[PDB]
Design a protein around this ligand. Structure first.
Ligand SMILES: Cc1cc2nc3c(=O)[nH]c(=O)nc-3n(C[C@H](O)[C@H](O)[C@H](O)COP(=O)(O)O)c2cc1C
Ligand code: SF4
Ligand code: SF4
Ligand code: SF4
Ligand code: SF4
Ligand code: FES
Ligand code: FES
Ligand SMILES: [Zn+2]
Lengths: 24, 106, 263, 426, 80, 210, 83, 26
């Protein structure tokens, strides 16, 4: 000629309902 | 060369891998093109057959020259898209020379 | 009564008068390679990939079309009916764009198989290929129609099974493109069936664009709950999340079709 | 042996020379025995054509009588119909443009004479839209005839009813096809229907229908007036009767003469028309039936006689009997190449073979004219040619393959040299 | 449209847990009999396998496409 | 074959058959069988073309409306036939026959002359939007091979110069003697009438008995 | 962070992994690299795209740069072509 | 020279004139 770290790169498959922060 | 990763997630590299090593899941990138969200070669599972090198239509996955990648921990051996793409960038010059020498034969 | 006897390679099957040559082969059990012929869609004869050779006859006949007559022995694996398929497959493939690793009807192609079983080992089309212009048929069906083999099953379904009567052929020659003349979306229920019915992957599903590839998909047969017709459906799951729901045939409830909502 | 007498020549008004209009037609005496003929019976009319043994005057050759006999079967409650195709897209068929323009009436009484033979309720004439002026002439003629009461209900003072209509073509060669003429008449795209349901049983507006070359309908009255025998004698065996011959290209006086059939090919350019431009030895090839039929080289031309079967023995078709002649001054590789260009710009695309196959031969043929393609490709074109010949839904794919087959069959050395010429200059 | 995969009967064990793996996100399964699908030529033989092996069975009758009458001439009917 | 709506060519261009045109429309229908109107789409589409050469998307929609057919049905008919023009057409719209018969008899010859005279490429309208040249296929009338159909005029047997003469006639004045500008009537052997030079037999000549 | 922005989160039970060891992510992300690629102007209605180098490139595909409205993009290279 | 001159509507209008003669529809 003149330490790794393995991880999943995909997103969250099943998003989760978030409860209403408004109290009732 | 431009900088667009060659893989287009046809996923037959996954189909022909004898050891079930390659795991690929894909989704259309915003560009609208087809790319792999996750490409994981489990090197401990891989038996280095070289069929993936064979199968790829765009020849995105290649058997690179380096044989010295011994690792202290088992997790390091599992490789995601970022390690392989980084491995690709580091050895691209020699990989290109090697494919250049052997493509007429294939 | 009403039972002609026709021989499919000398098997003396007996069929009601008025059954097509393709249908006669089916009861013996043989499959004529076919494109543009769907059981619940009108016979059109566009592809002529089904040419067979009735015995003692000068020309080969169109299976899907010729009503079988009395005592005509069909020779489905003759030296002729294979040159009548080895030479048609030459043509369908000639203008075809080879983006099979883009075409998500990769393993779900009735055109690679028939090429891979009944067609030819190599190509002789040293000339150039054609290209059509991708248009918008809506938000559900992705029409990468440079793939189209002009088999007119869409134009049929879109008129016969669903009453949309919008999709149509436009022009003549090798630039007959089967897309809406003006860009009006194909908005109707029963719309997604076009995907399932186009054997080519020209127009396929846009949400399930590139999430999977069919060999991987584990297929579990279940029931439609979105609507009360209770249409039978097959849920295709990969590594534990559902990737597609496509129809599975129930003569009485959904005969090969499912709603736009439940897929 | 040709040389038909002027008297025997059915289309006297050819070239005009006699008022194409009714009063000229009356001097022609075209409407002379029409009432009698219809009175005799439909069965009497078909007896006349069966005795005549007339062959189809359009590109396809079939017994005219048997074709008409097919829809003579009892009506099933659907009105039977007559379709006359005045479209003649094939190159060299100015054959029909004459009868329509010069002698419109002959065809009008051809229509009703033919109509009672098939018991047709009405006849639609599909003159190609290109000919707008031609249309102007026929309906003027059709209008005259009804005014006279020759056509219409109780036509020609007889029980029988007939109505004749003219339909506008729209520049399509394929419209000419028998199943496709119908669909254009039906108003859908001009795409040939499939063969199994023969146009007799299904057809225009789904009613029984029959299609005839305008020459075939026009020769009907006379064939009945002169009797099948008179007409039968001129022909040769199965071949019979005079058919108009059009000679165009590389001939001193190109013209359409209705000289007798079974004419030596050397004789019709040499004796009538005009001798081959440049001499009878300046004949690289002859296209007997028009573009669809294979061209025959001069070697056999002189020996050949112009008959439907004669050409068959010769591997070529009488077809529309349009003689196109090519002197030694023409690049045949390019001549036939434009006919394949003629067919890529025209085939409907309904069937896979023709759609891609004709385009595939066009691409190879253009390379062949340049000489860019290698010698081995020639055989492929042949092979591509027969794939399209037997697999097509209609005959046009049949027609596209034959000129390609002719060029390889007799002019294979010339194409190889064009192959060689380009390879040498690199 | 091929029907060569609708010919032989198959008996398939009930589907079980497929939790995501924390380190790489690969699907993980604790059920051994999941990927096993045995193929049996006839309904009677498959039922026999379940009985002697002691697995519970719920056979589903084959449903084959009903004969459908087709004829190119029929759609050309303007009437209908 | 895609109509991308353009301000000029799009339905904003309202289309409606002239009271006179609509009349023409109806009679046609009756020509066809009763209960059958669809069969008239072509003839009608032709009168929309007669009305206006452009025949925009708006015009086809009206045709489908008047003929009560699926609109696409009209769109398919317009696209299949070359007779219909879906783009603006030159006032004269000359078309040159270039099939082998005409080419063998020099059809190509004519083309070069016409391109120069119109001073424009083949396939587009003159700037003056005076003439439009197109290489059309066999237009019939081959015996007379050199040929150039102009709005049905169907001039025939033309030598290069003749056309220039015709074009000039078109450019200044009108009706330039359309037809074979040759000395042969309709189609006739240039030598004469070998077929029949005698007088035509009259009515009931040699009419066979029976 | 990464191509599809993998972000083991501040509350995830997996972000524990990088502690004392870096993560594998990519500079010169491809998502933007072809966007950085100039539009290949062409004369012909249709154009090929060997990917560059024939056997070493990609399945050869013919793209229809027929509408200036859209620069054809070979599904393999993501290269836009400007009619 | 009738052939020599005709209007764009000759075919259609002539036909309409013939409509009266045209026999009754099916
Ligand atoms: C592509 C194609 C074009 C045709 N064009 C014509 C035509 O212009 N005129 C014609 O009379 N027949 C044409 N034919 C033949 C007709 O389909 C039909 O066989 C013929 O007109 C019947 O006339 P005859 O039976 O009286 O000879 C064509 C056939 C094909 C396949
Ligand atoms: S690696 Fe080669 S083969 Fe495996 S998916 Fe990406 S492209 Fe297809
Ligand atoms: S359709 Fe898609 S998959 Fe089937 S062949 Fe054409 S490209 Fe390859
Ligand atoms: S789209 Fe699918 S179905 Fe419609 S024609 Fe093209 S291929 Fe046949
Ligand atoms: S051959 Fe096939 S394509 Fe060519 S015209 Fe006849 S039908 Fe249409
Ligand atoms: S399958 Fe034989 S006609 Fe399409
Ligand atoms: S080819 Fe020019 S008119 Fe026949
Ligand atoms: Zn590319």
């Amino acid at each position: 000629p003149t330490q790794y770290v393995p991880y999943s790169t995909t997103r969250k498959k099943i998003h989760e309902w978030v409860p209403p922060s408004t109290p009732y | 060369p431009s900088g667009e990763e060659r893989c287009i997630a046809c996923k037959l590299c996954e189909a022909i891998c004898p050891a079930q090593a390659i795991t690929i899941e894909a989704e259309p990138r915003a560009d609208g093109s087809r790319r792999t969200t996750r490409y994981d070669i489990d090197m401990t599972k891989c038996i280095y057959c070289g069929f993936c090198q064979e199968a790829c239509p765009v020849d995105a996955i290649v058997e690179g020259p380096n044989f010295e990648f011994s690792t202290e921990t088992h997790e390091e051996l599992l490789y995601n898209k970022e390690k392989l793409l980084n491995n690709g960038d580091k050895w691209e010059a020699e990989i290109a020379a090697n494919i250049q020498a052997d493509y007429l034969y294939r | 009564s009403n039972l002609i006897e026709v021989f499919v390679d000398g098997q003396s099957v007996m069929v009601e008068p008025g059954t097509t040559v393709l249908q006669a082969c089916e009861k013996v059990g043989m499959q004529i390679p076919r494109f543009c012929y769907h059981e619940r869609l009108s016979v059109a004869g566009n592809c002529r990939m089904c040419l067979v050779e009735i015995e003692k006859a000068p020309k080969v006949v169109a299976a899907c079309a010729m009503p079988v007559m009395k005592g005509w022995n069909i020779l489905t694996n003759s030296e002729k009916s294979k040159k009548a398929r080895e030479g048609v497959m030459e043509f369908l493939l000639a203008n075809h764009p080879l983006d099979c690793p883009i075409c998500d009807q990769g393993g779900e192609c009735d055109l690679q198989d028939q090429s891979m079983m009944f067609g030819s080992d190599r190509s002789r089309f040293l000339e150039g290929k054609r290209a059509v212009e991708d248009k918008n048929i809506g938000p559900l069906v992705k029409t990468i129609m440079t793939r189209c083999i002009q088999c007119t099953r869409c134009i049929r379904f879109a008129s016969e099974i669903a009453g949309v009567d919008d999709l149509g052929t436009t022009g003549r020659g090798n630039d007959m493109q089967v897309g809406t003349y003006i860009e009006k979306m194909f908005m109707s229920e029963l719309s997604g069936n076009v995907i399932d019915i186009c054997p080519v992957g020209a127009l396929t599903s846009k949400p399930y664009a590139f999430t999977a590839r069919p060999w991987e998909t584990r297929k579990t047969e279940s029931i439609d709950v979105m609507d009360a017709v209770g249409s039978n459906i097959v849920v295709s799951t990969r590594t534990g999340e559902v990737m597609r729901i496509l129809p599975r045939m129930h003569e009485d409830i959904n005969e090969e079709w499912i709603s736009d909502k439940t897929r | 042996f040709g040389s038909l007498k002027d008297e025997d020549r059915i289309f006297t008004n050819l070239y005009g020379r006699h008022d194409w209009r009714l009063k000229g037609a009356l001097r022609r005496g075209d409407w002379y025995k029409t009432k009698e003929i219809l009175l005799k019976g439909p069965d009497w009319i078909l007896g006349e054509m069966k005795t005549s043994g007339l062959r189809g005057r359009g590109g396809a050759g079939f017994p005219t009588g048997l074709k008409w006999s097919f829809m003579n079967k009892p009506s099933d409650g659907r009105p039977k119909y007559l379709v006359v195709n005045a479209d003649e897209g094939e190159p060299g068929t100015c054959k029909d443009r004459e009868i329509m323009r010069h002698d419109p009436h002959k065809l009008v009484e051809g229509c009703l004479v033919g109509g009672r033979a098939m018991g047709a309720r009405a006849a639609y004439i599909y003159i190609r839209g290109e000919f707008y002026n031609e249309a102007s002439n026929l309906q003027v003629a059709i209008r005259e005839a009804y005014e006279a009461g020759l056509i219409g209900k109780n036509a020609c003072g007889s029980d029988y009813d007939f109505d004749v209509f003219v339909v506008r073509g729209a520049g399509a060669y394929i419209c000419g096809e028998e199943t496709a003429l119908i669909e254009s008449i039906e108003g859908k795209q001009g795409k040939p229907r499939l063969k199994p349901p023969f146009p007799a049983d299904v057809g225009v507006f789904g009613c029984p229908t029959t299609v005839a070359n305008v020459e075939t309908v026009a020769v009907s009255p006379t064939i009945c007036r002169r009797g099948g025998t008179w007409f039968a004698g001129f022909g040769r065996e199965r071949n019979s009767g005079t058919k108009l011959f059009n000679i165009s290209g590389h001939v001193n006086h190109p013209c359409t003469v209705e000289e007798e059939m079974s004419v030596p090919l050397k004789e019709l350019i040499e004796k009538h028309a005009g001798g081959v431009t440049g001499g009878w030895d300046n004949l690289l090839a002859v296209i007997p039936g028009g573009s669809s039929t294979p061209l025959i080289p001069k070697s056999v031309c002189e020996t050949v006689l112009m008959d439907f079967d004669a050409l068959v023995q010769a591997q070529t078709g009488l077809g529309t009997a349009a003689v196109i002649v090519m002197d030694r001054s023409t690049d045949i590789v390019k001549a036939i190449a434009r006919l394949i260009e003629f067919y890529k710009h025209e085939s409907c695309g309904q069937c896979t073979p023709c759609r891609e196959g004709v385009d595939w031969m066009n691409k190879v043929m253009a390379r062949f004219v340049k000489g860019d393609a290698r010698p081995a490709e020639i055989d492929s074109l042949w092979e591509i040619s027969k794939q399209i010949e037997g697999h097509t839904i209609c005959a046009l794919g049949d027609g596209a393959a034959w000129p390609v087959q002719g060029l390889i069959r007799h002019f294979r050395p010339e194409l190889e040299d064009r192959m060689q010429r380009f390879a040498q200059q690199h | 449209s091929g029907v060569n995969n609708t010919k032989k009967w198959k008996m398939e064990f009930d589907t079980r847990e497929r939790w995501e793996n924390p380190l790489m996100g690969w699907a993980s399964t604790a059920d051994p009999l999941s990927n096993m699908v045995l193929t049996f030529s006839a309904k009677e033989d498959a039922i026999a396998f379940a009985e002697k092996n002691g697995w519970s069975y719920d056979v589903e009758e084959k449903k084959v496409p009903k004969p459908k009458s087709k004829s190119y001439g029929a759609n050309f009917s303007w009437n209908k | 074959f895609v109509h991308r709506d353009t301000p000029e060519n799009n339905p904003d261009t309202p289309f409606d058959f002239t009271p006179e045109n609509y009349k023409r429309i109806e009679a046609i229908v009756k020509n066809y069988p009763e209960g059958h109107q669809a069969a008239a789409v072509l003839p009608v589409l032709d009168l929309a073309q007669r009305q206006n050469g452009w025949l925009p998307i708006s015009a086809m929609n009206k045709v489908a409306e008047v003929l009560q057919v699926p609109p696409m049905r009209v769109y398919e008919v317009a696209t299949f036939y070359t007779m219909y023009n879906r783009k603006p057409v030159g006032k004269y719209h000359i078309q040159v026959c270039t099939t082998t018969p005409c080419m063998l008899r020099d059809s190509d010859s004519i083309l070069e002359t016409l391109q120069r005279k119109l001073g424009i490429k083949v396939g587009e309208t003159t700037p003056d939007k005076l003439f439009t040249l197109i290489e059309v296929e066999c237009l019939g009338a081959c015996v007379n091979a050199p040929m150039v159909q102009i709005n049905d005029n169907y001039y025939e047997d033309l030598t290069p110069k003749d056309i220039e003469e015709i074009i000039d006639e078109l450019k200044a004045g009108k009706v330039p003697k359309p037809g074979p500008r040759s000395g042969r009537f309709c189609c006739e052997p240039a030598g004469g009438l070998t077929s029949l030079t005698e007088p035509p037999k009259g009515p009931g000549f040699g009419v066979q008995a029976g | 962070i990464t191509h599809t922005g993998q972000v083991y989160d501040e509350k995830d039970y997996r972000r524990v992994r990088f502690v004392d060891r870096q993560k594998e992510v990519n500079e010169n992300f491809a998502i933007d690299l072809i966007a950085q690629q100039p539009v290949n102007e062409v004369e012909h209605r249709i154009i090929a795209c060997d990917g560059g180098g024939g056997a070493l490139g990609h399945p050869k595909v013919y793209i229809n740069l027929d509408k200036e409205t859209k620069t054809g993009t070979c599904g393999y290279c993501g290269l836009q072509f400007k009619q | 020279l009738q052939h020599h001159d005709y209007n764009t509507y000759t075919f259609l209008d002539l036909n309409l004139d013939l409509s009266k003669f045209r026999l009754p529809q099916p």
